[PDB]
Each structure stands twice: as structure tokens, then as C-alpha cells.
Write an enzyme that holds these catalytic residues in place. Structure first.
Site, PDB file in Angstrom:
ATOM      1  N   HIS A 186      32.249 -14.403  11.637  1.00  0.00           N
ATOM      2  CA  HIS A 186      32.448 -14.338  13.083  1.00  0.00           C
ATOM      3  C   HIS A 186      32.590 -15.714  13.720  1.00  0.00           C
ATOM      4  CE1 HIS A 186      31.704 -12.494  17.168  1.00  0.00           C
ATOM      5  NE2 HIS A 186      31.309 -13.730  17.416  1.00  0.00           N
ATOM      6  N   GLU A 187      31.684 -16.633  13.386  1.00  0.00           N
ATOM      7  CA  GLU A 187      31.733 -17.981  13.964  1.00  0.00           C
ATOM      8  C   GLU A 187      32.968 -18.735  13.491  1.00  0.00           C
ATOM      9  OE1 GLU A 187      29.931 -18.142  16.291  1.00  0.00           O
ATOM     10  OE2 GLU A 187      28.387 -16.692  15.720  1.00  0.00           O
ATOM     11  N   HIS A 190      35.991 -17.700  15.408  1.00  0.00           N
ATOM     12  CA  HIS A 190      36.231 -18.408  16.659  1.00  0.00           C
ATOM     13  C   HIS A 190      36.948 -19.698  16.371  1.00  0.00           C
ATOM     14  CE1 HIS A 190      34.036 -15.960  19.442  1.00  0.00           C
ATOM     15  NE2 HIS A 190      32.878 -16.131  18.833  1.00  0.00           N
ATOM     16  N   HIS A 196      36.501 -12.829  21.568  1.00  0.00           N
ATOM     17  CA  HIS A 196      35.758 -11.613  21.263  1.00  0.00           C
ATOM     18  C   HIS A 196      36.625 -10.393  21.434  1.00  0.00           C
ATOM     19  CE1 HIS A 196      31.709 -13.832  21.908  1.00  0.00           C
ATOM     20  NE2 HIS A 196      31.952 -13.682  20.618  1.00  0.00           N
TER      21      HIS A 196
HETATM   22  C1  LIG Z   1      27.348 -12.901  14.867  1.00  0.00           C
HETATM   23  C2  LIG Z   1      27.149 -12.438  16.323  1.00  0.00           C
HETATM   24  C3  LIG Z   1      28.175 -11.367  16.711  1.00  0.00           C
HETATM   25  C4  LIG Z   1      27.277 -13.656  17.242  1.00  0.00           C
HETATM   26  C5  LIG Z   1      26.942 -13.447  18.730  1.00  0.00           C
HETATM   27  C6  LIG Z   1      27.002 -14.789  19.480  1.00  0.00           C
HETATM   28  C7  LIG Z   1      28.463 -15.245  19.484  1.00  0.00           C
HETATM   29  O1  LIG Z   1      29.304 -14.627  20.129  1.00  0.00           O
HETATM   30  N1  LIG Z   1      28.743 -16.312  18.767  1.00  0.00           N
HETATM   31  O2  LIG Z   1      30.077 -16.595  18.532  1.00  0.00           O
HETATM   32  C8  LIG Z   1      25.520 -12.937  18.856  1.00  0.00           C
HETATM   33  O3  LIG Z   1      24.578 -13.620  18.460  1.00  0.00           O
HETATM   34  N2  LIG Z   1      25.402 -11.730  19.415  1.00  0.00           N
HETATM   35  C9  LIG Z   1      24.057 -11.265  19.774  1.00  0.00           C
HETATM   36  C10 LIG Z   1      23.779  -9.947  19.087  1.00  0.00           C
HETATM   37  O4  LIG Z   1      24.591  -9.025  19.150  1.00  0.00           O
HETATM   38  N3  LIG Z   1      22.604  -9.890  18.429  1.00  0.00           N
HETATM   39  C11 LIG Z   1      22.147  -8.571  18.027  1.00  0.00           C
HETATM   40  C12 LIG Z   1      21.392  -8.612  16.689  1.00  0.00           C
HETATM   41  C13 LIG Z   1      21.200  -8.007  19.066  1.00  0.00           C
HETATM   42  O5  LIG Z   1      20.336  -8.716  19.580  1.00  0.00           O
HETATM   43  N4  LIG Z   1      21.402  -6.725  19.344  1.00  0.00           N
HETATM   44  C14 LIG Z   1      20.513  -6.205  20.374  1.00  0.00           C
HETATM   45  C15 LIG Z   1      19.383  -5.404  19.737  1.00  0.00           C
HETATM   46  N5  LIG Z   1      18.734  -4.645  20.808  1.00  0.00           N
HETATM   47  C16 LIG Z   1      23.889 -11.141  21.306  1.00  0.00           C
HETATM   48  C17 LIG Z   1      23.997 -12.549  21.933  1.00  0.00           C
HETATM   49  C18 LIG Z   1      24.990 -10.217  21.916  1.00  0.00           C
HETATM   50  C19 LIG Z   1      22.487 -10.576  21.645  1.00  0.00           C
HETATM   51 ZN   LIG Z   2      31.179 -14.943  19.152  1.00  0.00          ZN
END
Ligand SMILES: CC(C)C[C@H](CC(=O)NO)C(=O)N[C@H](C(=O)N[C@@H](C)C(=O)NCCN)C(C)(C)C
Ligand SMILES: [Zn+2]
Length: 255
Positions: A186-187, A190, A196
Site C-alpha cells: 500500500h505505501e 502511493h 486511495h
Molecule cells: C496500510 C493502511 C491501509 C494504511 C493507512 C494509512 C495510509 O493511508 N497510509 O498510506 C492506515 O493506516 N489506515 C488505518 C486503518 O485502516 N487501520 C485499521 C487497522 C483500523 O484501525 N481499522 C479500524 C478498526 N476499528 C486508518 C488510519 C484508516 C485507521
Molecule cells: Zn494510504
């Protein structure tokens, strides 16, 4: 067709070395060799133009394992410092500042490769797993693939935003191996130019019955579904344009 590989600088900070590598250089190195290779399988087999524009991927050029924290003087900071910044009481840096610091400290080395990636083990607030600068086909683009210098008043040197980072700790535990693969994919996505995936008619965020979401969805996909490890049409279009524009710039032949 020969210049199809983005050479990486991969760095494992002292936290990753300790918690993921068991404090062993061999274990740490092999972990990151294997993970990048698995991520490369996804990239190389993707046909960015849905035809023959395939075979583009990543390959480690240099691996740096930071076995101990970086001793730092008062008021001074470094991405590999023992304490988290700016809030010493937190388990993790603020993620944006960490990526920014990494780019600054690793500048010299980053100017020599297509992309620089930091692997760490810290629990970023509010569920964040990784971060990265978005690449672009634009000539004067400052971010993502290919070192495009950005002067830095303060360090008397150029800084390159050809970076990203991955943490394998989230919510008080080590994330799954398949999850780690998805974070880096994913990173790096980007860095390769993808934004996204949006929801809706664009076909870039399928329902579970249609294979699930793609790797660039903003909310971390589980990796349980067919489309989870793959790139959506939205990511392909963006990355395709970026690669065809930057490949000749800094990509090299596979080794
Ligand atoms: C590899 C992932 C997709 C990266 C993104 C951050 C991003 O867009 N970096 O390019 C992330 O950490 N996403 C988190 C994420 O989806 N984490 C999951 C594990 C989460 O916390 N889900 C919520 C559980 N109730 C956010 C910021 C949306 C909370
Ligand atoms: Zn991202």
C-alpha cells in the site's frame, strides 16, 4: 522494457531489529528480504495497462539494520532515536513527523535510489499502519519514485521525498505477516503514484461478493479476500502514468 525495477533502500530501525528480528541481524535481514520479495510478486505480475505493461517491480539495493538507538543531544532529534517524538510518553512518533525526519536523516543515501523505506515497530496513534509520499508523472514532481531534490534551509542540503514507512505493530501487538505485506504494498503503491481507492460506480471498491476491496483502500484490507492483495483499476491508471514517465528516469534492470 529493460529499466523496469525500482531499487530500494530498506532500513530497519532499532525497534524493528529488537521486536521483529529478535535482536539478530540475520533474522531481521531475512524477514525484510522475504517481505519485499512477496510484495514484488504482486507488483511484477500486475499489468498496469491491462495488457503487456508488466514486469515492473521492486528490488532491494541496500539494507541497513540499526541495531541500537541513535544517541541524541538535547533538543536534537533523529528518526532512530530511542524516544518517540514529539510526545515522549507515547509508544510511537507522530507518523507524519517520523516520515519527514526519516527523509531528512537518510537524504544522502536516498538520493542514490529509486525509493527509501523505513520498517519500524511502534504503535502509531489511532490505528495508523504506515505512510508514504505520493508519486506523480509530472516532471517537477516532489514525491514518490525517483529522487527529485528539494532544498532544505536548515540542513544545507537536498532532501528527497522518495520515501515511505511501515510499522508492524498496531493496537498493542504484532500484525500478521500477510497484513505486513499489505501495508508495504500500500505505501509503496502511493510512491508509485496511486491515491486511495474511492467508493462508488468507479469499480474500485468491490463488495465482498465481488472479491472485496483492493490494496489502496484507505481502510486496511484484511488480506482474506481475492482483491485485497491486488491493485484496482483506479490505482493502475495512476501508477501506469507514473511508471511510463519515471521508469526511464530512475528504474533499473532486475538483478
Ligand atoms: C496500510 C493502511 C491501509 C494504511 C493507512 C494509512 C495510509 O493511508 N497510509 O498510506 C492506515 O493506516 N489506515 C488505518 C486503518 O485502516 N487501520 C485499521 C487497522 C483500523 O484501525 N481499522 C479500524 C478498526 N476499528 C486508518 C488510519 C484508516 C485507521
Ligand atoms: Zn494510504
Amino acid at each position: 522494457p529493460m529499466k523496469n525495477t525500482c531499487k530500494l533502500l530498506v532500513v530497519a530501525d532499532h525497534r524493528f531489529y529488537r521486536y521483529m528480528g529478535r535482536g539478530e541481524e540475520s533474522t531481521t535481514t531475512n524477514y525484510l528480504i522475504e517481505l519485499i520479495d512477496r510484495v514484488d510478486d504482486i507488483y511484477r505480475n500486475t499489468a498496469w495497462d491491462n495488457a503487456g505493461f508488466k514486469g515492473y517491480g521492486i528490488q532491494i539495493e541496500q539494507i541497513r539494520i540499526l541495531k541500537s538507538p541513535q544517541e541524541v543531544k538535547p533538543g536534537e532529534k533523529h528518526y532512530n532515536m530511542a524516544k518517540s517524538y514529539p510526545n515522549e510518553e507515547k509508544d510511537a512518533w507522530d507518523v507524519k513527523m517520523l516520515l519527514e525526519q526519516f527523509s531528512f536523516d537518510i537524504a544522502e543515501e536516498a538520493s542514490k535510489v529509486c525509493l527509501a523505506h523505513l520498517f519500524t515497530y511502534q504503535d502509531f496513534d489511532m490505528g495508523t499502519l504506515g505512510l508514504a509520499y505520493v508519486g506523480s508523472p509530472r516532471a517537477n514532481s516532489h514525491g514518490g519514485v525517483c529522487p527529485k531534490a528539494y532544498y532544505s534551509p536548515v540542513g544545507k542540503k537536498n532532501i528527497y521525498l522518495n520515501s515511505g514507512l511501515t510499522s508492524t505493530k498496531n493496537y498493542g501487538k504484532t500484525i500478521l505477516t500477510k497484513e505486513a505485506d499489505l501495508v508495504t504494498t500500500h505505501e509503496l503503491g502511493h510512491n508509485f503514484g496511486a491515491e486511495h481507492d474511492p467508493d462508488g460506480l468507479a469499480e474500485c471498491a468491490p463488495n465482498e461478493d465481488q472479491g472485496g476491496k483492493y490494496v489502496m483502500y484507505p481502510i486496511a484490507v484484511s488480506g482474506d479476500h481475492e482483491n485485497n492483495k491486488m491493485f484496482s483499476q483506479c490505482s493502475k491508471q495512476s501508477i501506469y502514468k507514473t511508471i511510463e514517465s519515471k521508469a526511464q528516469e530512475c528504474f533499473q534492470e532486475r538483478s
